[PDB]
């Protein structure tokens, strides 16, 4: 144990030196907190990521089924990146974006740079030139599956989309580190993600767990995200949070959830309480209270971060 722990520490250190910080971790380790991150819209997810948000200057993959919530997560990352004075770009090969929905999340759609490229290589090259400018804080690529090669589009073997991603990511990854720009690749449950799987510092699996009921009508979806890969903090953590149709991720809902999880928000049956005062009876009222009283929601948020060091 005594003489062994040194050789283990030494081995860990050599690995960390040889291959980079985060090359090996104990899963119970505390996360090493960076200066700045891009918050995701849910404190539960921010906590699951360990560093309180998405890492700067790294490749991120968000994948999941159709309408799983992965784009919503990406849009919140854009909103927050902009809300802190950043510039955003959206590389769009799907043509599915809903700007009004993005607006209600917090995206500044007017100053959002958008490109609807002709080919997969044009898409990645545009992303690259944008990244090497040093002016972007975040770029979203929607989506991996849509990055079809020129040759295929021009009617011309089958397999070079993988080769395209690989080539592009090798060049792009260096540009991202230097610029400090975060690149989010949205991906479905596909082709091209094999290289992305290794280049990405963070990989998030996004799924819908159950329908949220508004009496007997569908208000939204409880959403589950597993951080399957994480080079910035111990991986395999997961979070749940609500996405409300038309509104997005319920920030107030995650503050409550993580509130009670951390003992900062106590219970009296249906009654949610905070520092001796009542927030509301049931989650809806407690949530509705926090959007009405932004001051206390921010206090609840600040207390959760202090508690966990996020």
CATH class label of the largest domain = Alpha Beta
User: Can you tell me the number of structural domains?
Assistant: 2
Q: How many individual helices?
A: 11
Name of the CATH architecture of the largest domain: 3-Layer(aba) Sandwich
What's the order of the H and E elements? Answer: HHEHEHEHEHHEHEEEEHEEEHH
PDB class: hydrolase
Keywords: homologous recombination, DNA repair, atpase, recombinase, DNA binding protein, ploop containing ntpase fold, ATP binding, hydrolysis
Assembly: monomeric
Entry title: Mycobacterium tuberculosis RecA glycerol bound low temperature structure IIC-GM
Describe the structure.
The structure is a monomer. By secondary structure, the chain is α/β, with parallel strands linked by helices. The protein folds into two domains: 225 residues, Rossmann fold (3-Layer(aba) Sandwich), CATH 3.40.50.300; 61 residues, Rec A Protein, domain 2 (2-Layer Sandwich), CATH 3.30.250. 41% of the residues lie in helices and 25% in strands. A hairpin with a 2-residue loop joins strand 11 and strand 12. The longest helix is centred in the middle third of the chain and has 20 residues.
């Amino acid at each position: 144990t005594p003489d062994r722990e040194k050789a283990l520490e030494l081995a860990v250190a050599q690995i960390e030196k040889s291959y980079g910080k985060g090359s090996v971790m104990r899963l119970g380790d505390e996360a090493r907190q960076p200066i700045s991150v891009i918050p995701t819209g849910s404190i539960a997810l921010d906590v699951a990521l360990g560093i309180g948000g998405l890492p700067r200057g790294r490749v991120i993959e968000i994948y999941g089924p159709e309408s799983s919530g992965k784009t919503t997560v990406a849009l919140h990352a854009v909103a927050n990146a902009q809300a802190a004075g950043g510039v955003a770009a959206f590389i769009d090969a799907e043509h599915a974006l809903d700007p009004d929905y993005a607006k209600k999340l917090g995206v500044d759609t007017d100053s959002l740079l958008v490109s609807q490229p002709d080919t997969g290589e044009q898409a990645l090259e545009i992303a690259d030139m944008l990244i090497r400018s040093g002016a972007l804080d975040i770029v979203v690529i929607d989506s991996v599956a849509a990055l079809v090669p020129r040759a295929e589009l021009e009617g011309e073997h089958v397999g070079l989309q993988a080769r395209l991603m690989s080539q592009a990511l090798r060049k792009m990854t260096g540009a991202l580190n230097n610029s400090g720009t975060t690149a989010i690749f949205i991906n479905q449950l596909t082709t091209g993600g094999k290289a992305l799987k290794f280049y990405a510092s963070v990989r998030m699996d996004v799924r819908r767990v159950e329908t949220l009921k508004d009496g007997t009508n569908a208000v939204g979806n409880r959403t589950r995200v597993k951080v399957v890969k994480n080079k910035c903090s111990p991986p395999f953590k997961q979070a749940e949070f609500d996405i409300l149709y038309g509104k997005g991720i319920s920030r107030e809902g995650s503050l409550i959830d993580m509130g009670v999880d951390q003992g900062l928000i106590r219970k009296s049956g249906a009654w949610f309480t905070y520092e001796g005062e009542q927030l509301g009876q049931g989650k809806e009222n407690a949530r509705n209270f926090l959007v009405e009283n932004a001051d206390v929601a921010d206090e609840i948020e600040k207390k959760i971060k202090e508690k966990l060091g996020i």
